[PDB]
């Protein structure tokens, strides 16, 4: 599994949530921006690592950062279809 | 004790006088007009071109063009006579010692190119400074562009006057230094 971290610079775009192809991200209420909402990654075990969330993030440097961990890959982080690891 | 054999063929000047600092005193080189390899090479050029010429008709245009080529080759032979060539190749050399007063010296082309290259760079920089917009880089303001192009001739003086007066460089704290290397 990868590591998807959300930083304080988030401005509640919701673009990262919409771009995620495996429903890793979600919007949670907060009080650090005018949108009163920040992103969260409660399900990074389903994060394939496509980094579309990083493409969609418009902050100066990404408020959402995906750290690839190749020696950590699970069946969900690899998108295995022909083969089951469970 | 024969420095040629001591050093495996290469020969050393063995003399410490300022008169040998010129390239013309080198024993590797020799004036082209009295070098055997130069004579042989340009004679072979003449022979090959002449042999090609005889293959065509006498009254054809190709014959006249080959005569013109032969004249060009002979003019090249007589023009490179004062140029220095090695005592073993016959190919004339280019002098890159800053001599300023020898045939084939690299000082004159260097000066000419540096002037015109500074001219080009100065014209481009002036246009970029006077058009601080992206729209002016895709749709060139041709009158202003040619104005800067003509104005670039005084670059060796204007550029220095900007260097000393603090109008060329910019302090590092005003442009993006680069990627962060620390924070924690």
């Amino acid at each position: 599994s990868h590591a998807v971290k959300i930083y304080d610079t988030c401005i509640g775009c919701t673009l990262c949530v919409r771009a995620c192809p495996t429903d890793v991200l979600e919007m949670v209420p907060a009080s650090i921006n005018a949108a009163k909402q920040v992103a969260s990654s409660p399900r990074v075990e389903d994060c394939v690592g496509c980094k579309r969330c990083e493409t969609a993030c418009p902050t100066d440097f990404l408020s959402i950062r995906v750290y690839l961990q190749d020696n950590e890959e699970t069946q969900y982080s690899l998108g295995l279809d022909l083969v089951d690891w469970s | 004790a024969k420095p040629l054999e001591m050093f495996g063929g290469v020969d050393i000047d063995l003399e410490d006088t300022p008169a040998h600092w010129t390239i013309k005193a080198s024993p590797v080189l020799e004036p082209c007009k009295d070098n055997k390899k130069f004579h042989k090479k340009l004679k072979d050029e003449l022979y090959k071109v002449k042999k090609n010429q005889q293959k065509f008709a006498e009254g054809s245009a190709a014959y006249a063009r080959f005569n013109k080529k032969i004249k060009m080759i002979e003019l090249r032979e007589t023009a490179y006579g004062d140029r220095l060539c090695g005592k073993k190749d016959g190919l004339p050399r280019t002098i890159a010692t800053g001599e300023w007063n020898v045939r084939g010296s690299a000082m004159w082309p260097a000066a000419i190119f540096l002037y015109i290259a500074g001219w080009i760079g100065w014209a481009g920089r002036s246009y970029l400074i006077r058009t601080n917009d992206a729209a002016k880089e895709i749709n060139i303001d041709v009158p202003l562009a040619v104005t800067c192009m003509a104005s670039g001739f005084s670059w060796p003086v204007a550029a220095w006057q900007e260097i000393v007066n603090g109008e060329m460089a910019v302090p590092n704290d005003q442009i993006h230094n680069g990627g962060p290397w620390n924070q924690s």
Partner: protein
């Protein structure tokens, strides 16, 4: 109507695409502007504009081809030794191409005739002119004039159709009308027109030249007025192709005229048949393939296949007079059409992928795994078999065990079907020769021919694997389930799932171009070595044959070292030792430049754009230091563009290397 044809958009670059309307903020904007220039589908406005753009651009390109033809005709009339070539084609190399005497470039022109010096052309235009009964300079003048008039007409038509066609325009969608009129009026009614042209201008002329009257009484006989010669004057019974014309070393032009007449009749009858014939099975294909990209792909594949048929049929089915002996011309005519076949096949695959992404695919995409899997297995099988017979021969020859290799004098793999394929030609049991030169002798196919044909099959199958894998896995895949939303061309989907680089159909074309290039480089080498070794060459009066390569193919082409030594090294002596030699200086220089360009491509092929972006930023620091700010911000090439540039330079450099290598050698030997 035409009041809207305004220049106001000429200054406004990038107007056609709404993604470029934000302005040139970065240098990526320039490359995107060039990339979307001909992508009429994604450009602004309705579908009618797409049709107008496509049709008018077709007309403009047709005008461009006509202009190229006109240039060739004017070069032949005013910058050529076509006169002396007409008088004596066996002693004069064709040349309609001079070089100015600048920077010593005069060394490029070589002796072609006693009154002419120039670059030996290998386009075969002189043979075409002679087969077209063109003798006087006035005929070439008027051919050039007609081609220029056609250029102007097609340019004006392209200009007009951008406003003649409207939103209601529908003539392009009438596929029944297009097929019927094309077939009948062009393939039938123009083939018979060319048959008429030949019967009335070639047979009156080409037999006169072959009859030894190159004089032809000037215009007294050559300018038609020869209705006392009969159409089938010198058919000499026999069968078309069994007996060649002994003078010009080609099929008699009367037989060619009869061929064109009969083919026109056949096409007209097929157009009549199409009123009631076999249908209702290709009907799903009929309804599902009415789109620009699908018909473009179909036409590209068809034209490329026709190009390869032309490449194989222009060499040992000699049609043109005095062309079989002109070995550089034969080589060029084969190899150029081979390369065009490969390139247009690749384009057909690309546009199949584009159609799949824009339109809706057909039934074959649902069992795509068995298809693209048995294709994988067959590619592996014929790669581990065809090539390795070369590796086996190489290893056992290096070991000193020649009796264990695959050769004719050893374990031999007989080409059973080809050896039993004496159906083609079926000529008499001897050879044909014109003047110290072999016209055509039957290629005796042995073990080496078997192995190299299997190499060809393997390379073709791998290129097809890449193309069909790109086409079938365009919409979605087990790897990425929404490839349709990603578009046609994309760098990747991200480093996730292990890595998703080069999943797009565009990247599949990117690999397929490399594999097609590798596929027909072997085809070029097989042809270039086989013809020299076993067909082309001198002769001896005692019926003995001395070929150019002295029969190296059957003894050396069984091992990779044989290809390296006897083809890429021994036969490269002409190009490598081509400096200061009048005709072949540019070929040596272009050999060097092709090596440089091919190696230069590797910088784009092996590297990623992030390193170059960081380097560009480092340089931009120095630029900003001296108050030199490019407001079109410098960005490195996009990933797809980096791959495209790498592929283009790779193929261009390699093609130039082969081009120089083959052409210089054939010019020296001839």
């Amino acid at each position: 109507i035409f009041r809207y044809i305004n220049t106001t958009l000429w200054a406004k670059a990038g107007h056609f695409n709404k993604a470029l309307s934000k302005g040139a903020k970065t240098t990526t904007w320039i490359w995107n502007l060039h990339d979307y220039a001909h992508d009429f589908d994604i450009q602004q406005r309705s579908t009618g504009l797409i049709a107008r753009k496509v049709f008018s651009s077709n007309l403009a390109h047709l005008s461009l081809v006509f202009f190229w033809i006109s240039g060739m005709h004017l070069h032949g009339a005013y910058l050529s030794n076509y006169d002396i070539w007409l008088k004596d084609p066996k002693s004069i190399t064709p040349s309609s191409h001079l070089a100015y005497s600048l920077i010593g470039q005069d060394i490029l022109n070589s002796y072609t005739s006693e009154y002419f010096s120039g670059i030996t052309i290998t386009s075969g235009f002189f043979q075409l002119y002679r087969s077209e009964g063109i003798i006087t300079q006035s005929q070439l003048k008027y051919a050039c004039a007609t081609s220029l008039i056609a250029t102007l007409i097609c340019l004006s038509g392209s200009y007009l159709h951008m406003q003649l066609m409207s939103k209601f325009t529908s003539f392009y969608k009438k596929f029944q009308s297009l097929s019927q009129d094309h077939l009948i009026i062009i393939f039938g009614s123009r083939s018979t027109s060319l048959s008429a042209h030949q019967i009335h201008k070639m047979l009156p002329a080409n037999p006169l030249l072959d009859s030894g009257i190159s004089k032809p009484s000037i215009l007294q006989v050559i300018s038609n007025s020869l209705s006392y010669t009969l159409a089938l004057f010198s058919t000499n019974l026999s069968s078309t192709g069994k007996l060649l014309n002994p003078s010009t070393r080609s099929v008699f032009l009367s037989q060619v005229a009869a061929h064109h007449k009969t083919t026109g009749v056949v096409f007209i009858t097929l157009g009549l048949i199409r009123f009631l014939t076999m249908y209702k099975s290709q009907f799903s294909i009929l309804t599902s393939y009415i789109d620009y990209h699908i018909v473009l792909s179909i036409n590209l594949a068809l034209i490329a296949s026709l190009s390869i048929i032309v490449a194989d049929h222009l060499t040992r089915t000699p049609i043109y007079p005095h062309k079989s002996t002109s070995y550089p011309t034969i080589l060029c005519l084969s190899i150029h059409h081979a390369w065009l076949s490969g390139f247009l096949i690749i384009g057909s695959g690309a546009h199949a992928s584009i159609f799949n992404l824009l339109g809706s695919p057909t039934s074959e995409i649902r069992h795509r795994d068995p298809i693209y899997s048995h294709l994988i297995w067959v590619c592996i099988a014929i790669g581990l078999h065809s090539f390795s017979l070369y590796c086996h021969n190489d290893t056992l020859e290096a070991l000193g065990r020649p009796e264990d290799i695959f050769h004719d004098n050893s374990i031999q793999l007989k080409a059973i079907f080809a050896k039993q394929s004496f159906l083609r030609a079926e000529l008499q049991p001897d050879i044909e020769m014109l003047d110290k030169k072999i016209i055509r002798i039957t290629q005796e196919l042995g073990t080496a021919d078997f192995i190299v044909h299997h190499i060809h099959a393997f390379t073709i199958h791998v290129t097809l694997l890449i193309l069909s894998k790109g086409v079938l896995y365009a919409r979605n895949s087990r790897f990425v389930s929404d490839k349709l939303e990603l578009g046609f061309t994309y760098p990747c989907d991200g480093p996730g799932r292990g890595g998703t680089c080069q999943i797009s159909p565009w990247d599949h074309l990117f690999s397929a171009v490399f594999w097609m290039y590798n596929c027909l480089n072997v085809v070029t080498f097989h042809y270039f070595w086989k013809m020299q070794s076993d067909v082309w060459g001198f002769v001896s009066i005692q019926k003995h044959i001395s070929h150019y390569s002295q029969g190296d193919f059957s003894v050396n082409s069984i091992t990779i070292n044989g290809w390296l030594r006897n083809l890429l090294w021994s036969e490269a002596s002409q190009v490598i030792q081509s400096y200061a030699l009048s005709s072949i200086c540019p070929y040596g220089f272009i050999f060097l430049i092709g090596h440089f360009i091919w190696a230069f491509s590797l910088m784009f092929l092996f590297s990623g754009r992030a390193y170059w972006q960081e380097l560009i930023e480092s340089i931009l620091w120095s630029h900003h230091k001296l108050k030199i700010i490019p407001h079109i911000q410098p960005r490195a090439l996009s990933i797809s563009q980096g791959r495209a540039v790498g592929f283009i330079h790779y193929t261009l450099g390699g093609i130039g290397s082969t081009w120089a290598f083959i052409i210089s050698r054939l010019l020296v030997l001839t």
